[model samples]
Target: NATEIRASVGKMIDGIGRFYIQMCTELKLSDYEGRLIQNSLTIERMVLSAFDTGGPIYRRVDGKWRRELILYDKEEIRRIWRQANNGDDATAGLTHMMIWHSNLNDATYQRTRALVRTGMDPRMCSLMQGSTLPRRSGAAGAAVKGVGTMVMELIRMIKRGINRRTRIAYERMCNILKGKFQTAAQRTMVDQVRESRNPGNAEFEDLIFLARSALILRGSVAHKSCLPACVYGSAVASGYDFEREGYSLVGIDPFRLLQNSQVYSLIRPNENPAHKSQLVWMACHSAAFEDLRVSSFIRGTKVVPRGKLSTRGVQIASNENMETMESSTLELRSRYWAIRTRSGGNTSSGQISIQPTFSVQRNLPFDRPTIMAASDMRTEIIRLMESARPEDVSFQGRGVFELSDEKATSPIVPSFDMSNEGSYFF
Candidate 1:
């Protein structure tokens, strides 16, 4: 009977072998090394069979199927099988079965155990009793989760850092307008401000508009309310109905309201002037379609073979120019439509073409090296902050406060102070 049982189990094993061969052929792996293919297929079939027979299996509400197995408890049965087939033990039948069942029971347990036990000493179990244990709630667990959150947060912070740097650069350039220029320096600084290295390119200009749009969207998201009523109410007050035009202006051209100085001034008066000026300029330059023109002509007369138009008794009548320009300028009453649209067309595109209207430039006498040094220090601080990693909140082991001395005398001022003296009056 024992021999018969062994024969039957052997047949089942052979069937598994055949199944693996079929799989290899189907996967176009017939040319793979026979032993390797056989081993892989055997492992797969054993695991699947173990999972199927191990316990109650059911699909969950989320559509994933789950099964449970008690591998440690089944170790005795595996050992019995091994002893029964001692004569045919080279196949490691019992050990292989136990391993397969154990792996199916806890898929990640072995890998996780191995990682935690790498340098651990098993013989000194008392010394390391709870040292390598995974904490359910402690600093270790918190650290793991913190690392994941920090990675994503750092990416966002880096983006913010770049934006801050860009704002600083814009401010620096705009400030230069306050200085008395020798014409040459003004020309150079103006050119530098508009160069690719400074403002980047047209796409960067577009991104600036997108940033403002994002700010508006963020406000709505955070505040749980739409932009201030006055922003759109002004249009309604001017006799133009926003109820009809709101969707069009907000949908197809979300930037329309943001691009206009009047609307932006109404909404975010405290917005950085450099960025606002840039946005207004972009709106005027690109969105204003009034200056673009198109014309067409039609050949009405017959032409001679040589080169001239044949006008033999057939008069070449001339017609007035058909390409007439239409004025899109708003009339007095039409001003309401303009306000309602809130489009940035009327705003001057070249508003910042010459230089920023605000004086941002700091003037230090060239002869005063200390003033120049301080200015240079400020620039260096900005550059360092811009290039710093998101996690780096401080510079040179100190916070941003250490960047400059608040009480330090201005390089422009040469020691000046006022004090009162106490005296006895006769």
Candidate 2:
């Protein structure tokens, strides 16, 4: 009865959900490879909630506020990328993605060049017709498995309203449960009792080391572990910033790459694509990794330690059933792997597990459901869209934008939370 709502929640559930499942289907994840796909993504987003950043990059479009278009600003990485491209072989880092950037930052100039090369706009570049450039996505917006992911990510950019912001509150509380709640009064009393009972017994650097040593830092990892997902999401959110970059819903796994500066010698393609291992390229310097940071506007997080979490759901124990934290704390184990890969030792268990594929980047939704349906296993969601909207781009073969959602007084599908999990925020 007390679920607080937000303006963006409904819109997101009804929107991104469709694309989410659509993503899984394309991956043939529909193969039912493992329920782990959904659970992993679900759990990962829980972590992402702690690290999610800003709402869409807002700008006045035709006097109306609309999410900005594809934004990228990694000039430092881009410059190095350009230099690396000079040689015949491709290299690891920014240029790999930046060079193949589908946005074509120089929109007009490249548009003209593309016209000269392929003869027209996106829709008209069909294979049957004579054109030099070809597309992985067929005329109807359908793309090859991996190729489809890229376009989907790009399309999501145009629809950048949803992000961790929508489910920020819920995630905070979920995390708080892993331990990490305290009261200054309680803290003072405990220390006072101890000190009065014994001589020289004082809080050590404000840390009760032994007490915490027994505690577990549960679920502190950021959700979006995929490197390309991190690379692409961060790249677009930067919005072409040369000085300061914008943040995306899932910030780059900053810890993955660099310390002072993330630069590596160079990357080259192996003679045989059929080698024992795959040659992966990252969007930033091979050695560069930065932890996600929030911008000034959307920089706070809240939690609920007094809450109870079970497989079924979470129940509030008090009026608030939650607390708030203005800052973020990434677990120690989380940082170690990131530090190793760039420094010297082998990358973390997760990073080593990260195999580069057509899985992420270039096209990625700026924000997604921050806290997923916290109950049992869950995957993609469905939202209502209209064919008339240009960006919604009528479902192919419909010819006319015909399918529709039941008209409602309110635009959302009901739930202030990002998911249809209902009644409870978690």
Candidate 3:
């Protein structure tokens, strides 16, 4: 009959039934929730299978032994087991202990000795020692397989603990939002957005968006993941895509979407269409002005005119027709007492005159002749004259004076110091 049952089931049926019974007995699932009970049962079955495969071991750490199933390398298995049982705290303590043990130059017994030296509560020190112990050692190696199973169960427990905390946080947020904004209408509107679908409320949404942008901007600035390929792609494809492309803000253009509803809902719809439009316009204007300021800083003090100049040539004209000439001129009358200095030139002790043209008069007319300054004269003259012409290369023409004066010599004029009375006499 046993052979018949085994053959019918494709395995040993009685043994399987006995195994399940043993599992249910050991887990004691009678008081637990269905899911929890089921999980326990599954783990029990796995543990039993592990026991059958490689037996089990007892591990000693900090002078105590624990019976468990072995699943991985000794150290990893021990670490995972601790993490499962004590969550983050266990892992942290174990990590410190391991680090201390590894660095023999550092006091190997520091953590254990400190626990004793501080006269810390026996309960706390015991807890620390329990967490830091490796899962298997010495004769306990035989029980490693069973300890490995326990380690796996501990891992599941740790995951559940994290999930529990997350659920609590989510519930707390929901409760806070409910209390603050009690109105059903407000709740309905807030719930419609993408962020509110998560555990976060409206304020949480604002914090998340801002934090995300800050993180992305930091990474982008540091040249790590330039522009954050993943986050940037998602942000652009989302409703706020236009915002990333230099637009200040974006919102649902409800008027375009709901034309027929707008007619009947005009009797004080929740949001005013005109108000929304004004908000969008103001935001865009502010952003555009900011961009303008940045551009001005980059471009500096140059003014670029859109139109072409009417004419280009040097013209000598009277003061009466100066406005018509579109340029200005400056003349200096020098008593030619040329004291020969660094430059090799013949001295002339007579009156000499110099004439130079400028596109605009300097603000301080007689402070110093900018044109006469050796450093700035040529460059400043070219800049000022070019401003009158649309382009710099437009004035490369051979004048009649230059063509006719192949061998003719011209006198160099230094300056003429003249007063207003002298001009009147002239």
Candidate 4:
């Protein structure tokens, strides 16, 4: 049944929500951070579903709404200006209306307004009447590629009648994808900027505007998110380039890496990951399957064997390396992590340390022909989240993602005959 097929994909969203629900709970993030998270989720959903949303075209000025009016031709603008300036014209009110409804301070508008006020012919006011830039589009505007359709609910939220949070939520989406997911650093900046956007202050008309604009800049520079590979970054014939780590560009090729992309090895070499308060989430596949196996959030499901704790400590190097390491052994069967270390006296090398280093076939119970992968989903997720591609996340199959340190390190896992596609995340 397509009903089941449809649900197969929806499971990933639910599982991811479960994952983030726990993440937000731990971070104590508010709607600001939630807005950023939702942007990533939208991109994730695009994989299976035809999800879409474009950045909004309006900007707030003194909390007043002004419909977009950029379509005026130059001649029309001059005639309107003349009519307003000419004390004898029948349309004496036109200039006042234009100034009231449009950006008179805008360079083009302002220059023209001043020129028309003195009966001097303004340069582009009569030429580039609607455009502010020397060219057809602004660098950021052109660089950020939002297109056609957008979310209906989001649009509704923008109207005066909808709930306040929903409208601001929609506004945040318009300002989103400036690399909110590359690292937790951007989340802090978002929170900081949002704090500056406090409702009580009737400060700068564009105070939040400017504050959010800082987030856009922070997204690319101060934060970890980068441009989309399709627009500015590099690309591969298939699969991905490991060099792209720490970058929020297009990281995976779903069409080419579909079979291999679903699972992830998020272990980056220098960074030690946080101790997950919810160790249940420390799985290569769907923890929700077990949690939600009934509710089962469905990246994949595992019937983890009941276990007892076993531990071991070993020196990563010789007496030259006095430091020793320990392993947190056993969960179903296998688990791995990333670390920066001194091996062979090379202290600078970063590596993934798999527990039970002996080559054992790691257990993963959710290998099925009908399931989806997280990396396969996230590669695009990172891409769409770029400041450029307003291509919000979409989805089809239910999916779950693997996690690690900052890096997405692949470790060898035992293969199971679950899907005809293949076994991956090794």
Model 3 CA deviation exceeding 4 Å by range: 1-68, 71-190, 195-203, 206-426
Please write out the lDDT profile of model 1 over residues 1-426, one tens digit for every residue. Answer: 634644443433333333334433433331212222112423343334432212221112133222222232243333332333332332323222332222122111122243233322222211111122222222221121211121122223334444667555444433322121222322243334344333333323332222222211111100000112222323333344332232222121222332231322111222233332222222221111111110000001111111121111100112311122111111111000110111111101212113346667743222222123232322333343343232221111111111122321322211112322111000
Runs off by more than 4 Å, candidate 4: 1-169, 177-410, 413-426
Query: Cα deviation in Å at residue 26, candidate 1?
Result: 2.0
Taking all chains together, each candidate's TM-score versus the true structure is: 0.15, 0.16, 0.12, 0.16
lDDT of 2 at 175: 25
Residues 1-426, candidate 3: write the lDDT tens digits. 633532332121112222233333343322111112112223322432332222222222243322334343344333333332323223222222222222211111223443333233222211121122233222211111121122222323334444457546444433323222222322333234223434223433332222222211111000000010111212222233221122100111211111111111011123333322222221111111112222122222111111211111111112322122111111111111111111101102322333446756643222121223223222332343332321111111211111122222433331223322111000
The residue-by-residue lDDT of candidate 4 on 211-317, one tens digit each, is: 22322222221100111111110122122332222121122212122222211111113322222111222221212112222111222333222121111111121
Q: Which residue runs of candidate 2 sit more than 4 Å off their true CA positions?
A: 1-16, 28-31, 34-184, 187-206, 209-426
User: Which model is ahead, 1 or 4, in terms of TM-score?
Assistant: 4
Worst 10 residues of 2 by lDDT: 376-385
Q: How many backbone clashes does candidate 4 have?
A: 32
Please list the C-alpha lDDT of all candidates, in the order they appear.
0.24, 0.21, 0.23, 0.24
Order the candidate numbers by lDDT, best to worst: 4, 1, 3, 2
Which RMSD values do the candidates have, in order?
36.3, 29.4, 39.4, 28.0
